[PDB]
């Protein structure tokens, strides 16, 4: 039944990118309080399937399109409260809300989209939010300020387990070609132009940016798992303007620039788009595939692109001035021609330690896979899809096999000491002794396993304190080491929960 | 499920007649608030079946017995908060709570015991209460103050109708001989006495008193519907003392005094009582029946009584000092020898008006059957079982046939004017005109019907304002009237809801 | 979930006449159910659903049973005269004589039927002139009456035609 509610205020002038507000999902249920809220207190833990309903007067004369963004791990909130770049709002699970369609509804399986069960008395990891932003603005301001109502419907029952089912399990050789929640920021057409071109890059492994901020997300991370891709792009086009705006588009794929000859343009295999609908366009390339990521100094336009040509319009009655926005969603690469996977089932670099200033150095790892920092030596972190996947999920869990390699800074004959791997259960202070391991420095390499997890079952992508196994690397002659490299190779079944994003 | 809760506080010295507290049933549910409370808000109206549970550490060493009294219409609250005489606490539906039995439970069909459905937002008539009082005290104080927990369990669902099913329907010729909630105040035996007698009167139509206060109740009212009764009294006896107290009773019926000869006493048909249990004793009388009520200067002992003779004990270890209490419950008269009904299916006196001081007099009746007052004339109200039944229920509804009779104060030849019966729907100010009726004073009598009820379906036994038909008697030559008598005769199906009591 | 009906199948108040200024008073009813006016006495009209229904339809037709009740203004022993119910077919001038009826004032009550209708079949809610039965109440000692009350009870099948409204 109705479990919780909230209100979004809409400014009489709702421009593209306006932050409209954030609702806190747990507060919606607890402020309402709530037949469902009271069932929750008894259950303790709930893994709801929500129906979210946004009540909203339908109107075809505004052109307004909003985005509801499900931010279960509070990753974009900080960055959108002034203004919400679409790159942020579309980097987490989200839904387009078209004003022409009025009242909106969708399902959120909290087991999938989030991954951990909700505790009645307090937030466990971070507090789950719904963000409401404006993707395409109104063509002219409306008569007055107004509001929309957000409602949560659910039948809460006691959760049997803490963890959901994993959204993703790590596998280098597996990127199907199907996507979810891959929405391109809006493309705009001026009505003061008789024709026009808008390119969308198809180099989908590229990490999106907002100014100097990189926004890592699961989709670009997935694509990066492959060297390149060919095939047909299946997607949907939304025309986000008032009924009295209209346009006709020729949508086609081109390689390295665009032709300047209108007649050549129409000898290509494209499709016409007059209205909201799906489309399929073949990725066009001399190699039949476009590369997954760019090299130094190449552009996305240098490769295969999805080109939107306005061949008639846009038109509108006078005196409208608003641009006509097109929102593109990419659903999958059908009939895919994939390259080799970019990585094999092999080790990859986690971290290099170098330039040691003290002979005694102790690197605490504990039960986490994360970015190191040191005041006493130089840390160089690895960048690879696995690390990105860690960053683009709320929770993860698994086992990493480690290979340690090191070279000497001093003469081999003078060398002494060891790379020691301390393995405990608990912490340095009260822990139990596991398979700790002393590698004489002359071995020049060593191996160990690392449990990434804890008694609860999964790690957040932050610092946390939960009883688990505990690991540390101890150097006693660190100045004799030119470099200590740590490689890892996830054991099968390394699991990720709740897709999200990670701005840096 | 658990719907509401509350706490009663017990003093280390809990003496007979201590008032322990009152819980407000609706507050218990709303303060808890409550999966059931929230279901209630949606239903609007509920007609619950409650399971009441009193949690209570069982103990055989105290002698403590409490009474929970269900006072849905707030009739005894005022009178028990200083001291709670058992006459008040047992005059409404109630339950004995024996300390030796520990945790206590019972069902309350709110449809029967109360009669009207509960409105989520506010009290409709009066606010339903549970009173907790001590019936028999502890033999010696306990070690410390303590508490008991009261719990309401219910599965609230929306009520289809406002009114329950009627507890009682008026019928002069119908008193079965079965009782509910007929509990006699505790009888006490001193342990400083080798034998003893305690009489319980069997003149059950007599109205119980607390000081100068009459406590009208349904049971005595029922018995008054008959001229007398013979047969066998079936009941239960509770011995309300610690396991280390014990007694043996000879229980027998006697007429007009008691025999002084122990040998004669045991030639009577009595029963022995050694412990908690049921009993059957024949009502002994020269006429085989004892009268339902007393005449002037008669005494309850002059008739048939139920006598409790302590023939062995009570005994207790030294140095106990408490008396041993016996609580008697009367369940029915089995194999009943009833007298004629005291009333036939006929009219009875509602009210006499006399001694008018003004020629213009207007008596407003409206839609109620109630006690009149006047500053301008003498009101003499009738006392009969019907009036008592009105007083001993929370709600009632039905139709009364009225006969009006009057005699002249002036000479007949000089007489003028009328007894006018105004009949409206609504009120004097905005009402519609019904079967109003002008009786020329010389008619000397007249008849009319009166609806006792309203749009909601029933009347409380208080002043209330609910749209209904409206009646008034209008005199224009009142000084010419020596007496205006109004008789009434309830039409079949006159209904009463929720048995209760009425102290005056 | 309905309440009781507000009215039962019973009489209700049509009109009270009171405060008579002349001993000779004659109230013409004819064949209509309507609001009375008098220059010589006080008219108090009843308000009930039946009267509203009469007002909220274009035409109506039926039969009303009447109960007349009255109380005296003078001393009973001095009373004389009558409440007379004149019943004609036609009009006062050329009519035929029906069940006219003389109630000695001392009876203090009387009954009669009234046809609400006419040869055409129904009455408008206005004044009209259509041949029908004709009724009048005749007082000869009206100053001796404190109040004359007229109750009516429609016989089954009292009919209304054409729903409408009535602003006042």
Numbering used by the authors:
A (entry chain CA), B (entry chain BB): 1 to 504
C (entry chain BC): 337 to 504
What text comes from the article?
The CP folds into three jelly-roll β sandwiches. The B and C domains clustered at the 3-fold axis. The structural variability of CP subunits within a capsid was very low. GFLV and TRSV are both transmitted by Xiphinema nematodes.
of a GFLV-F13 particle is viewed down a viral 2-fold axis. 3-fold and 2-fold symmetry axes is 155, 137 and 123 Å. ligand-binding pocket at the surface of the GFLV-F13 capsid. be recognized by compounds of the nematode feeding apparatus. axes may constitute a ligand recognition site. surface of the protein capsid which may constitute a binding site for the vector.
